Each structure stands twice: as C-alpha cells, then as structure tokens.
Amino acid sequence: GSSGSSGKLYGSIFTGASKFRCKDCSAAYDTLVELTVHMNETGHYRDDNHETDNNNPKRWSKPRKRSLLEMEGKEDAQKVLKCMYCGHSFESLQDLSVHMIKTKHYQKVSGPSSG
Ligand SMILES: [Zn+2]
Ligand SMILES: [Zn+2]
Fold this sequence. Notes:
The protein has 115 residues and is mainly alpha-helical. The chain has helices spanning 32-41, 93-102; strands spanning 20-21, 28-29. The chain is built from 2 helices and 2 strands.
C-alpha cells in the first residue's frame, strides 16, 4: 500500500486602509476629490462628525476671569531733544546725534532686568 496527505501552512493576512468613507453606503475612497463627487452624484454624504448646531443647551461651569493690572513706565512729554542716558536738553539735532556717538549713550541705555 501507499497513500497519505499533508500540508499545514497559513498566510491569509489582510492589509487595507481607507482615508475617507461614506455614511450612506459602504464605499470608501482615498482622495476627498473622489468622495465628494459621489456624495453629490448619488447624494450620500461624509460620516465625520457634523457641526450643524450652535445652540448649546448644556450649562457650563463658572465663567472665566483674569486680573487686569495697570501701571506706567518712563513717560516724558517734552518738546526738546534730550538724552535719556544723561539728560541734557539740546537745540539742534546734530548736538544730540553728535553726542550719542561722542558719548556712546545710545549704545548703552539698558542692561539687566528686574521683572
Ligand atoms: Zn455612498
Ligand atoms: Zn547722553
């Protein structure tokens, strides 16, 4: 005699994804430009959440609140050229400019920080 059987192997893995999907029917697509066409052609529409409502009957917890402090800085309403570094009123621009350089005050007008 001589007879027998064998062969036990597997391999039926399924791999497939879809970008967009139709609610009405089960027809999915990859590009929106393709789906839309169907949504109108046939009439169906997307499934993704829909925001066709604004009235929120759901009460919300206490409202929001924040402190609105207030303060001013180095304000000076003058009418004459005056260096903020040293503090010497002038008559003409040059006097001021030629000074900012001759003294290099415009280069050093600040430094560290407090808060
Ligand atoms: Zn459809
Ligand atoms: Zn100066």
